[PDB]
């Protein structure tokens, strides 16, 4: 985003004069072009181009192209309107609200408008919800998927988290760079983001309003399609405080009373393109009451909720009653004969079934009967969980007849209707918090813990299908129907004479090893759960010979071999002499497979049982995997490529026994290693994950004293990875204080010559760039724990003689070379240039060359104000700790005045000011600065933060706060800013006269007192504020 510096290098090389000021008015014009084919191609050009400008220095011109696409919302070519909304889905409307506050001429723009330029309420009420009410079935579907992409990106004003638009952009870029009941509902305490529940409750406010106050057929019809795609990405049970509107007034039943009145009308179900999306959304809103209500329909326990469930269970047995009389040509509790409202629903399921049986096309997702029969067996399932035996006991006759006819069309979710019935027939925050102080303290808290039978006709039909089908979505739901007939002890009479079904599961292991099987991935976790659970009644000797074939003789591990053992290990280690021999077999196989990070989740299960069963056996097994993995981490055979992969390996060294990690002979030879070649970002990325996860052990599991006595014996030279050694790989008396401090400051130097000087799509991926800038995020959390916690005494003093020192003739990454890389990290990665601000303070390096670029000491780029206001909250907290140095007090107050006041709701700059009130000479310099900056302290939010900082100052400087309270700030037209500077000026006069009359007269001069009262009589200010004028007349006459 350095459009300043990069354009200088080209112009002296190729002498063209072509800036980007001469191409955006060439792109603003083709959006206004005549032909509707010319307008489809110019709005894909803004999909690429307005996420890069709006966070750049040209973001004055970047906001204007957001404005013009909004006029393109009502052109009559159906491909012109759907490539608009994709360039209004990829907008980050928390970064867009930040530029509005900075604008003064852009709010006016053309024709000199007055008011605010409200992009967000105009792009959300008048495009995205508005384009739901379009006539095309093509335009209504694409507008729903944007409200899945808009809700994490809104920033409505004044939440109880993010306050400013400055603090809003800083929290979406710190989560990136600093780290069986049915599917409907939840029973957890459900930890949730408080401010992400607020953006999802304003998008379900304006969406239930064009469904009730709408006057068209087309607004009611395509806004039941936009509520079914929220609840499959933002479910109701997890985000219930967003969905809540009214019902039970407190775990919610949100908005489900309107939508039942849509279905009970005789108009709305007569078209299957959006009657199938109003059934998946009425089962999500009666299931979020399940964590509350459950203690006719005796398990509901809330009589204001029973007519909502009586209706859908009456509505879903009359729609499996019209799908049973259609799949079988039969003439027309659940009964649709006598209703004339549901004889209209029998002519609509018979138009979509004459086109399937006549036109052969098997692989269609959208069929509108095959799409409609999928919708009304998914939601007959989710209600039976709320039901009991007593409510269904008159209906087990009913629902089983319909499915025998409803079996052949869609058997994949007609056993999901059968899997559930048998359960319930058998009972069953101000930019210092976000960037540093909230992620810094999840770091140090996990280190102290590191110091620690009507089914008998229907069941026989489902087994003939598994031997003869080929779609592997159907083969997965039939291996869960048989793991429930063995837990709920149905006797093994499904195969009355022979062993027909169990012989067929053994043959399928022949097709996976060779590879003559198409979709073995989605069946191999559920093939092996069925087999181990039968042996408690094929025995566990025979089960483990089948899994050994797949691994060594077959496909790769992360699909076949590693999901093969998740059923075995959980069902063998968790749940006499025969059981001892089989546990030795399973632990040997994983040692061949330690390399994968999914195999390291299975082995956290193994170490927690030995601490419970037998603590003599617990310490033998943590020594055997100590000398396997640490030879792998030096030769980089361990797949730690993911941030799912570094999370599994750090909960391992807590649970591994500390006797196996107590000699530091092994952890250091695995640490101080050089990889083979660091040319490739497959190989650069696995060497810097071996150094971050054995360094979580040398901080918790062993203190500072033990580590440095060893390196005096082991000759680990600090020229290990030096600037002569690092250069040939990319192309291809030392203290123990001195050996370990050159290794952690030149590994900050490897991660920062890449992210600046590597291309973004050429050498690395983007999934490989989520985890390359995230290994620089947890290695700067390891360096501010050593310098602050004080347990590491020797390592703090070693860096201070090095950042002050030059490199050894250029053989090291010297401290002026390392800091040029970081100021071009300002703009691409602004959350990680706040962690490099807190290291340079901590070493005694307060060098005013680098601290002026980051604070700009004498529209805007949106990604620098996180760092400019982030390095001034961190530069005060270094001043507040050691306030004895007066050289740093007089710099930050004289220069940064409009920034020092406007941060005063923050815990590190709230403490900077109280010490100034403590100090005699430091209080007098703060008041000379406001008199120069009274021209900017006139806006109504900037003046409320001065009076809380000019509230209580030193009593020796209360004579300069009373000439500022009268001359400058009292003449404001705000009548609660003229009323609150009457509380603070009458209070200076009262503490002074009970004080000494000697020191106060030299404070407020007798010649200076007569200047003040001439200002109040020619004006009306004395006659307005009576309490201020009474106190100053008694001052003179005693003196």
């Amino acid at each position: 985003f350095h459009v300043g510096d990069w354009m200088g290098t080209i112009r002296t090389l190729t002498g063209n004069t072509f800036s980007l000021a001469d191409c955006i008015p060439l792109l603003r014009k083709t959006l206004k072009d005549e032909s509707s084919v010319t307008c489809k191609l110019a709005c894909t050009a803004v999909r690429n181009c307005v996420m890069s400008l709006c966070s750049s220095s040209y973001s004055e011109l970047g906001l204007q192209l957001i404005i013009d696409v909004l006029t393109l919302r009502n052109s009559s070519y159906w491909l012109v309107r759907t490539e608009l909304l994709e360039t209004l889905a990829e907008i980050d409307f928390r970064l867009v609200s930040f530029l509005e506050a900075k604008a003064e001429n852009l709010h006016r723009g053309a024709h000199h408008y007055t008011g605010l330029l409200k992009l967000q309420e105009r792009v959300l009420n008048n495009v995205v919800i508005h384009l739901l009410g379009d006539e095309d079935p093509r335009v209504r579907h694409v507008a729903a998927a944007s409200l899945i992409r808009l809700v994490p990106k809104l920033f409505y004003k004044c939440d109880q988290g993010q306050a400013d638009p400055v603090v809003a952009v800083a929290r979406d870029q710190s989560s990136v760079y600093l780290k069986r009941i049915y599917r409907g509902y939840n029973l957890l305490p459900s930890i949730t983001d408080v401010t992400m529940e607020n953006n999802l409750s304003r998008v379900i406010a304006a969406v239930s309003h064009e469904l009730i106050t709408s006057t068209t057929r087309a607004l009611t019809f395509g806004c039941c399609e936009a509520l079914c795609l929220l609840s499959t990405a933002f479910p109701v049970c997890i985000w219930s405080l967003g969905w809540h509107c009214g019902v039970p007034p407190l775990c919610t039943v949100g908005m489900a009373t309107m939508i039942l009145t849509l279905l009970s009308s005789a108009w709305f179900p007569l078209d299957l393109s959006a009657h199938q999306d109003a059934l998946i959304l009425a089962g999500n809103l009666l299931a979020a009451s399940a964590p509350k209500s459950l203690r006719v329909w005796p398990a509901l326990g809330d009589r204001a909720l029973v007519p909502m469930v009586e209706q859908l269970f009456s509505h879903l047995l009359k729609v499996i009653n019209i799908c049973a009389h259609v799949l079988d040509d039969v003439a027309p509790l659940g009964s649709f004969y006598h209703l004339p409202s549901y004889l209209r629903l029998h002519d609509v399921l018979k138009a979509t079934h004459a086109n399937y049986k006549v036109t052969l096309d098997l692989q269609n997702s959208t069929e509108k009967f095959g799409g409609f029969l999928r919708s009304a067996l998914d939601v007959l399932s989710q209600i039976l969980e709320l039901a009991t035996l007593q409510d269904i006991g008159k209906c087990v006759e009913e629902i089983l007849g319909y499915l025998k006819s409803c079996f052949s069309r869609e058997p994949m979710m007609a056993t999901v209707c059968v899997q559930q019935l048998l359960k319930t027939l058998f009972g069953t925050p101000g930019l210092y918090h976000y960037c540093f102080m909230a992620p810094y303290t999840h770091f140090t808290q996990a280190l102290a813990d590191a110091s620690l039978r009507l089914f008998e006709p229907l069941v026989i039909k489902a087994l003939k299908q598994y031997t003869t089908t080929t779609c592997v979505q159907l083969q997965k739901q039939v291996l869960d129907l048989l793991a429930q007939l063995v837990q709920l002890r149905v006797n093994y009479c499904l195969l009355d004479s022979d062993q027909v079904f169990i012989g067929f599961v053994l043959k399928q292991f022949e097709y996976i090893e060779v590879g003559q099987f198409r979709e073995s991935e989605a069946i191999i976790p559920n093939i092996f759960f069925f087999l181990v659970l039968l042996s408690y009644e094929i025995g566990i000797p025979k089960i483990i010979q089948l899994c050994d074939g797949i691994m060594a003789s077959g496909r790769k591990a992360v699909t076949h071999a590693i999901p093969a053992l998740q059923p075995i290990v959980h069902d063998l280690f968790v749940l006499g002499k025969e059981l001892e021999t089989q546990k030795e077999v399973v632990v040997s196989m994983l040692l061949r497979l330690i390399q994968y990070h999914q195999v390291l989740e299975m082995f956290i299960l193994v170490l927690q049982q030995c601490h419970k069963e037998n603590e003599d056996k617990w310490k033998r097994l943590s020594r055997q995997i100590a000398d396997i993995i640490l030879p792998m981490l030096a030769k980089q055979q361990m797949h730690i490529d993911s941030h799912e992969a570094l999370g599994v390996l750090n909960t391992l060294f807590e649970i591994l026994a500390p006797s196996s990690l107590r000699p530091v002979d092994m952890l250091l030879r695995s640490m101080f290693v050089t990889p083979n070649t660091m040319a490739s970002v497959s190989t650069v990325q696995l060497w810097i994950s071996g150094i971050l996860a054995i360094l979580r052990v040398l901080i918790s599991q062993s203190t500072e004293d033990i580590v440095l006595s060893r390196i005096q014996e082991l000759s680990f030279s600090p020229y290990l990875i030096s600037c002569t050694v690092i250069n040939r790989l990319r192309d291809g008396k030392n203290l123990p204080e001195e050996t370990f401090s050159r290794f952690l400051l030149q590994l900050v130097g490897i991660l920062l010559e890449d992210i600046v000087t590597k291309q973004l799509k050429v050498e690395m991926s983007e999934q490989q760039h989520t985890f390359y800038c995230q290994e620089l995020g947890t290695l700067l959390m390891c360096l501010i724990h050593i310098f602050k916690s004080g347990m590491f005494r020797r390592i703090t003093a070693a860096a201070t003689r090095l950042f002050r020192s030059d490199g050894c003739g250029g053989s090291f990454y010297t401290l002026d070379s390392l800091n040029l890389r970081a100021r071009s990290m300002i703009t691409t990665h602004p959350a990680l240039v706040l962690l490099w601000c807190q290291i340079l303070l901590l070493v005694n390096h307060t060098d005013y060359r680098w601290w002026a670029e980051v604070q700009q000491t004498p529209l805007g780029m949106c990604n620098r104000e996180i760092v400019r206001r982030g390095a001034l909250i961190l530069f005060c907290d270094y001043v507040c700790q050691n306030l004895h140095d007066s050289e740093h007090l007089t710099w930050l107050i004289v220069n940064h005045i409009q920034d020092l006041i406007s941060l005063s709701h923050e815990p590190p700059v709230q403490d900077f000011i109280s010490a100034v009130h403590r100090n005699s000479a430091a209080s007098g310099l703060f008041i000379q600065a406001i008199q120069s900056r009274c021209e900017n302290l006139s806006t109504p939010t900037m003046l409320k933060k001065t009076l809380q900082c000019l509230e209580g100052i030193h009593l020796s400087q209360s004579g300069a706060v009373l000439t500022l309270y009268v001359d400058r700030l009292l003449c404001t037209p705000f009548r609660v800013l003229a009323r609150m500077v009457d509380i603070l000026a009458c209070r200076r006069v009262e503490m002074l006269l009970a004080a000494n009359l000697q020191s106060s007269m030299a404070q407020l001069p007798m010649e200076e007192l007569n200047r003040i009262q001439e200002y109040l009589q020619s004006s009306g200010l004395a006659q307005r504020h009576q309490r201020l004028y009474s106190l100053l007349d008694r001052f003179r006459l005693s003196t």
Partner: protein, 374 residues
């Protein structure tokens, strides 16, 4: 945010004045009325809306019967008061009361049940972190910026009088007088009838309230102005009704506020407002009376009439020792003085520890109002 702001509501009868603490003027001021559809409606796609609250009821007046829920500083009907506060918070201010401490004003010598039930609703209806109930007259004194005075508070609810000296307060010298704006309205519609204009219903009772809010004034001598009513010229004023009917009111105009100084016209023995001020000042200690005479503060909506201050000055000066000078300080803006006094109080830093907390209520119950606060 710092300090959380705070919320302030004045409910004397007649008007809700509400807004944020820390501002010079309230955001929302509206009539405290709950107006119910008396006539059964016959259309489809109306409302229905059981009742209308606030200036919505003023707009749709003719259908509605209007019920003031507060009479004489006393809430008659609690659900109607809850509806009015529901309207303040959600319809105007758009606040969650959970996010703000709320100050309520309340009148002197008022039944305990109003303060205790008022707190019970504030905690167990609109969940709120903290609240306070405060006396109307002291808030107006704060708004006037004076430490001392005798505050003559007269709203549409009742008239009250609280002498204060250097802060402090004198409980025995507090006087409450049952006269109001509303009783002047009932007198006024009674004195229009002799002219032939008959206003019989709640809807045009608020039309004579509007008449009295501008046309009415107080005589600097009653008999002299009643004598010059023989030659009618300036004392008559044409008034336009919303019907398009014209009303012409002569001497009848200034003898309506005269009732404050002559409650024999209403038929009550209870002394006029200047003798009630003497009754309060006479109950005070001899020493302080000098500044109470010179620091009389008028507050409330029914001290707005032109010439009240001059009439009170002439009568109190006539009754009192002419040894000392009787200054009356009656600001314009005196209508909103209670709300401004509530704004300044909740903006005070020390006052932020004297709040009744939600926690302290949950432990010690609704009765703690009187125990902590005045």
């Amino acid at each position: 945010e710092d300090e959380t702001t705070a919320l302030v509501c004045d409910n004397g009868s007649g008007l809700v004045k509400a807004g944020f603490a820390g501002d010079d003027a309230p955001r929302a001021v509206f009539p405290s009325i709950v107006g119910r559809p008396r006539h059964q409606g016959v259309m489809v796609g109306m409302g229905q809306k059981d009742s209308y609250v606030g200036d919505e009821a003023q707009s749709k007046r003719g259908i509605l019967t209007l019920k003031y829920p507060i009479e004489h500083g006393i809430i008659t009907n609690w659900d109607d008061m809850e509806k009015i506060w529901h309207h303040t918070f959600y319809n105007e201010l758009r606040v969650a009361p959970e996010e703000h401490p709320t100050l309520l004003t309340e009148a002197p010598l008022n039944p305990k049940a109003n303060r205790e039930k008022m707190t019970q609703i504030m905690f167990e209806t609109f969940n709120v972190p903290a609240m306070y109930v405060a006396i109307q007259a002291v808030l107006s004194l704060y708004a006037s910026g004076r430490t001392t005075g005798i505050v003559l508070d007269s709203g549409d609810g009742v008239t009250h009088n609280v002498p204060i000296y250097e802060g402090y307060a004198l409980p025995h010298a507090i006087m409450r007088l049952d006269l109001a704006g509303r009783d002047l309205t009932d007198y006024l519609m009674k004195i229009l009838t002799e002219r032939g204009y008959s206003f019989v219903t709640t809807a045009e009772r608020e039309i004579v309230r509007d008449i009295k809010e501008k046309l009415c004034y107080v005589a600097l001598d009653f008999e002299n102005e009643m004598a010059t009513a023989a030659s009618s010229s300036s004392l008559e004023k044409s008034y336009e009704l919303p019907d398009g009917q014209v009303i012409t009111i002569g001497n009848e105009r200034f003898r309506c506020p005269e009732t404050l100084f002559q409650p024999s016209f209403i038929g009550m023995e209870s002394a006029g407002i200047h003798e009630t001020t003497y009754n309060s000042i006479m109950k005070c200690d001899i020493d302080i009376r000098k500044d109470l005479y010179a620091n009389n503060v008028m507050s409330g909506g029914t001290t707005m009439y032109p010439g009240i201050a001059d009439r009170m000055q002439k009568e109190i000066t006539a009754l009192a020792p002419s040894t000392m000078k009787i200054k009356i300080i009656a600001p314009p803006e005196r209508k909103y003085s209670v709300w401004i006094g509530g704004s300044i109080l909740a903006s005070l830093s020390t006052f932020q520890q004297m709040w009744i907390t939600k926690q302290e209520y949950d432990e010690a119950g609704p009765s703690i109002v009187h125990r902590k606060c005045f």
